[PDB]
Amino acid sequence: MLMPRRMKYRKQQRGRLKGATKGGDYVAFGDYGLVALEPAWITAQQIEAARVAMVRHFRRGGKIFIRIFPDKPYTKKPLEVRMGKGKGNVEGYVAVVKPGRVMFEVAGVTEEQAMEALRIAGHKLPIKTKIVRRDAYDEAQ
Amino acid sequence: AHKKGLGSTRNGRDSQAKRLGVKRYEGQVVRAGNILVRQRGTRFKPGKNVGMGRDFTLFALVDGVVEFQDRGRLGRYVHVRPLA
Amino acid sequence: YRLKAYYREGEKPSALRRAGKLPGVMYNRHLNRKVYVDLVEFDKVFRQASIHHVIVLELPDGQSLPTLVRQVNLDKRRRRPEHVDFFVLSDEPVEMYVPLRFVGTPAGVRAGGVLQEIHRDILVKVSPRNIPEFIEVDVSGLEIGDSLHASDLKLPPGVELAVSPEETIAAVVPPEDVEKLAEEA
Amino acid sequence: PLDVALKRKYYEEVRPELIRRFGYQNVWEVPRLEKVVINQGLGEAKEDARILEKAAQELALITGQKPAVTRAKKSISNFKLRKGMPIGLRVTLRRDRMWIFLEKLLNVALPRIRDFRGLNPNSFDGRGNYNLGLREQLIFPEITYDMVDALRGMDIAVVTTAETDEEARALLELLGFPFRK
Amino acid sequence: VRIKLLLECTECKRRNYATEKNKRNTPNKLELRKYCPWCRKHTVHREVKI
Amino acid sequence: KFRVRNRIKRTGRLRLSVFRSLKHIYAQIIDDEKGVTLVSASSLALKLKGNKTEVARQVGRALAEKALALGIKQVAFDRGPYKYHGRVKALAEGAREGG
Amino acid sequence: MKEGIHPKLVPARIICGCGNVIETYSTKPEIYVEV
RNA sequence: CCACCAGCCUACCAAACCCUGUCAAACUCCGAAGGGUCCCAGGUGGAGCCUGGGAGUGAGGGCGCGAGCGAUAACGUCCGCGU
RNA sequence: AGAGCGCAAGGGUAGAAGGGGGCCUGACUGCGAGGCCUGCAAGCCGAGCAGGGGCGAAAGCCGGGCCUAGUGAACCGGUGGU
RNA sequence: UCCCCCGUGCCCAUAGCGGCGUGGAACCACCCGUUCCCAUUCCGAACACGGAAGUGAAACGCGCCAGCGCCGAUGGUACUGGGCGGGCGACCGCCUGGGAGAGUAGGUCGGUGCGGGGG
Structure with missing residues (x-):
């Protein structure tokens, strides 16, 4: 989780999400990484779920970084209502993530550690991902 | 069915869009009293027989044809030059 | 080390790509022809390179010339190289990223702690007569909270610097556990 | 010209010491005196009219000139006064006028200050400027008890063509400014 | 508004x-x-009535 | 610092681009657009006299004739820091009609 | 300084506590103080 | 731990700034594809212009992509270009 | 140019629209070329012309306000005049 | 024909900053006097009116440097007319033409006409 505590617009329109990551597939941080495969929102609930499952499995572990950040307002209408009359509610605080975007990375772990960890952490999220090392990513800032 | 407490709004209010834009360009004869630039701030500064009014609007003073100009450390220019 | 090269003509990349050749451009001072290589040995060799090591491209033109890399645009989608830039070398003081090899196991390290990999690759002005290989970086006496930066690093006699030097090249950071489940609060 | 005591001495004494020790092989770059403004801005002009500025003009009356009631700038709720027209008493002194100013100053003004320990040395701007305040208005010669209300200090400002510490400092010591230590 | 009136x-x-x-x-x-005024050049003018 | 183009409030029609400086008075009359000038008259930069105010007088009127040789009738005294103390040559009698 | 209602000038002395005799030129005619 | 006033220290909080990446309909340094309109040119078609009598028509719907809304549900509704 | 530019924000502005002083009173009169806009109606822009008026040494600006909101056709009747 | 400067204007920062070197012989600028013209919500600073001695630092004019600042090719890609499949959608692919900024190379502290004086 995490988000602004006071931004600019309570509500904002859904939008269209096709692809291209916009920017963010290299590193400069971790030594292993987890990268998305589909153009969807990732919910901060799921995000912190991953953060958990991660630091959870590997206790006393080093530092993990989240390149993403859940800053998209979901419009959730009250339950059992009728059409029109308004909109949703500032629920589902999430982020816009497209394939090829490094959601999150580990550094200081172990090989199989980072493996199983990021493996499960990714298995949590509403998609599927790529577990990546660090070599080609070099340069691009 | 059961439809409990819902609500309302406050935003069903819009400003009547007023047709704004530039009407005449280089290549068109404009003869004395023809508006050719609708704007709010100085998007287009007047000049050579060009005119401005009480609301930043460019028009024709002569029976001349429009043309443009760029002067960075001054602004954007329109010059409606006629014939010798 | 060694790698093949061939002159690009101007044929649309789409084909060159879809076959097996990796398209790219090379240049020096004013020269700017177009070229291409071959993914597999290109990939394999580049691992033993980047802007850390020097490369050589032999060409069926009668001339074999070495370059360094630079700017690598990618596919984003499905993640992999799809274009490369190669700056032809010289002997006149050039600027690029020398690797910093982390060395030292102090108090930040060992007693928990994780190194802050900021700048392995750092902007330096070295004469292409000299070639700094693996600039050592002293970690031998650092503790969590602190860092290391500036001229503290190794400045080989044939290499000059020009970044800040302020820029923290590395630091040590605190680990995590179930104590952030207390933060969960 | 208006020959006072420290003026004639500046003419003469300044050239030997300044040119010999500091070394200034330029007849006109040589950074000497400059503008000396006196400023007594309060903030108590919440109102009380210019019966409160009448006090402010009495100040300029002592320097031998008439002032301008420069003022504030913004809306301050805390100590009242918004917009920006209260009390920021100011006058501009130059050449032969500031001459008589500092004249009366180091001649007779300064010694009766009560905590006249030593002219504060740590108030250097560093570009040929020197800024300081004071605790009593009557420390200067001309004004005696027959006008005083309670307390009305002054923030003296003296810019100099100088640019560094040493030159303007010893300029103050060649125009009589007895520092702390 | 009448306070500014006419x-x-x-x-x-x-x-x-x-x-x-x-x-x-x-x-x-x-x-x-x-x-x-309608007749002749600029002259005086006095305010009166609502 | 006196720009404002007072010359824009002189873009009205026909210019007299000048400037005053310590020793010389640069009284010039300029055809604009192409910025092609015409009529110059100066202090001792015209080799006339040494006091700007007297020079002015004489110069303007000398300048008058110059203007009146090239079919010149009216322009506008050009300066932002002008202040206008006249220098009652004020290029008014000096050809222009001026004031 | 110019104007007109300016508080004027005129010389002033100094009959200090030591016997000093300084010659000043400020605003009030009778200036004298301490040292 | 002192006063004429300062020192000093931290796996604390944080103004700002520098770097590391980063996000945006109501952010915009750059800015297309495109549309728009004048100028010269071709284009003979139930093109077009101009005045004049007769209408009807004003619940429309689907698919197509581009946006809203819905839950990036609806053989859902809401607009736009396209049929 | 992040200040301010009455009020909401947009656009705009320090080569002024902002802020200081002096004379004033063009929130002028009789007309309006030709254009914005558009179902009608209403709204928007203004050259020039002539009467005289204010400031400007002049060249010259002035038919309210930096603009977009502050509005109500007609029928009825009040009131002063022709 | 051109050299140095002054008045000036055009390009719109590759024209700007900063560091630096140089000029006052005509100039420019400080300077100089504050009686006169004249003004400052206060200042002869500013605008001035009258100008001998001096100065070339500051004002500026010319020169050298890129550190900052501005420009930015060329490869490739984004997105896209128009055409055509594939997927339950979320969405992906191909041709035809159109073609960015991101950045790398590298560029750049100037370009220039009217008028005036001295040589």
């Missing part, structure tokens, strides 16, 4: 007209502004 000035030397507005709230005692 009043009309008239020339002296018989009648004449021109239309205006006031501000009684603002220090507006009486008005004798200088304008031009």
Whole structure:
């Protein structure tokens, strides 16, 4: 989780999400990484779920970084209502993530550690991902 | 069915869009009293027989044809030059 | 080390790509022809390179010339190289990223702690007569909270610097556990 | 010209010491005196009219000139006064006028200050400027008890063509400014 | 609003007209502004009536 | 610092681009657009006299004739820091009609 | 300084506590103080 | 731990700034594809212009992509270009 | 140019629209070329012309306000005049 | 024909900053006097009116440097007319033409006409 505590617009329109990551597939941080495969929102609930499952499995572990950040307002209408009359509610605080975007990375772990960890952490999220090392990513800032 | 407490709004209010834009360009004869630039701030500064009014609007003073100009450390220019 | 090269003509990349050749451009001072290589040995060799090591491209033109890399645009989608830039070398003081090899196991390290990999690759002005290989970086006496930066690093006699030097090249950071489940609060 | 005591001495004494020790092989770059403004801005002009500025003009009356009631700038709720027209008493002194100013100053003004320990040395701007305040208005010669209300200090400002510490400092010591230590 | 209200000035030397507005709230005692009538050049003008 | 183009409030029509400086008075009359000038008259930069105010007088009137040789009738005294103390040559009698 | 209602000038002395005799030129005619 | 006033220290909080990446309909340094309109040119078609009598028509719907809304549900509704 | 530019924000502005002083009163009169806009109606822009008026040494600006909100056709009747 | 400067204007920062070197013989600028013209919500600073001695630092004019600042090719890609499949959608692919900024190379502290004086 995490988000602004006071931004600019309570509500904002859904939008269209096709692809291209916009920017963010290299590193400069971790030594292993987890990268998305589909153009969807990732919910901060799921995000912190991953953060958990991660630091959870590997206790006393080093530092993990989240390149993403859940800053998209979901419009959730009250339950059992009728059409029109308004909109949703500032629920589902999430982020816009497209394939090829490094959601999150580990550094200081172990090989199989980072493996199983990021493996499960990714298995949590509403998609599927790529577990990546660090070599080609070099340069691009 | 059961439809409990819902609500309302406050935003069903819009400003009547007023047709704004530039009407005449280089290549068109404009003869004395023809508006050719609708704007709010100085998007287009007047000049050579060009005119401005009480609301930043460019028009024709002569029976001349429009043309443009760029002067960075001054602004954007329109010059409606006629014939010798 | 060694790698093949061939002159690009101007044929649309789409084909060159879809076959097996990796398209790219090379240049020096004013020269700017177009070229291409071959993914597999290109990939394999580049691992033993980047802007850390020097490369050589032999060409069926009668001339074999070495370059360094630079700017690598990618596919984003499905993640992999799809274009490369190669700056032809010289002997006149050039600027690029020398690797910093982390060395030292102090108090930040060992007693928990994780190194802050900021700048392995750092902007330096070295004469292409000299070639700094693996600039050592002293970690031998650092503790969590602190860092290391500036001229503290190794400045080989044939290499000059020009970044800040302020820029923290590395630091040590605190680990995590179930104590952030207390933060969960 | 208006020959006072420290003026004639500046003419003469300044050239030997300044040119010999500091070394200034330029007849006109040589950074000497400059503008000396006196400023007594309060903030108590919440109102009380210019019966409160009448006090402010009495100040300029002592320097031998008439002032301008420069003022504030913004809306301050805390100590009242918004917009920006209260009390920021100011006058501009130059050449032969500031001459008589500092004249009366180091001649007779300064010694009766009560905590006249030593002219504060740590108030250097560093570009040929020197800024300081004071605790009593009557420390200067001309004004005696027959006008005083309670307390009305002054923030003296003296810019100099100088640019560094040493030159303007010893300029103050060649125009009589007895520092702390 | 009436506080600013609406009043009309008239020339002296018989009648004449021109239309205006006031501000009684603002220090507006009486008005004798200088304008031009239908007949002849610019002259006097006095304020009167609603 | 006196720009404002007072020359824009002189873009009205026909210019007299000048400037005053310590020793010389640069009284010039300029055809604009192409910025092609015409009529110059100066202090001792015209080799006339040494006091700007007297020079002015004489110069303007000398300048008058110059203007009146090239079919010149009216322009506008050009300066932002002008202040206008006249220098009652004020290029008014000096050809222009001026004031 | 110019104007007109300016508080004027005129010389002033100094009959200090030591016997000092300084010659000043400020605003009030009778200036004298301490040292 | 002192006063004429300062020192000093931290796996604390944080103004700002530098770097590391980063996000945006109501952010915009750059800015297309495109549309728009004048100028010259071709284009003979139930093109077009101009005045004049007769209408009807004003619940429309689907698919197509581009946006809203819905839950990036609806053989859902809401607009736009396209049929 | 992040200040301010009455009020909401947009656009705009320090080569002024902002802020200081002096004379004033063009929130002028009789007309309006030709254009914005558009179902009608209403709204928007203004050259020039002539009467005279204010400031400007002049060249010259002035038919209210930096603009977009502050509005109500007609029928009825009040009131002063022709 | 051109050299140095002054008045000036055009390009719109590759024209700007900063560091630096140089000129006062005509100039420019400080300077100089504050009686006269004249003005400052206060200042002869500013605008001035009258100008001998001096100065070339500051004002500026010319020169050298890129550190900052501005420009930015060329490869490739984004997105896209128009055409055509594939997927339950979320969405992906191909041709035809159109073609960015991101950045790398590298560029750049100037370009220039009217008028005036001295040589």
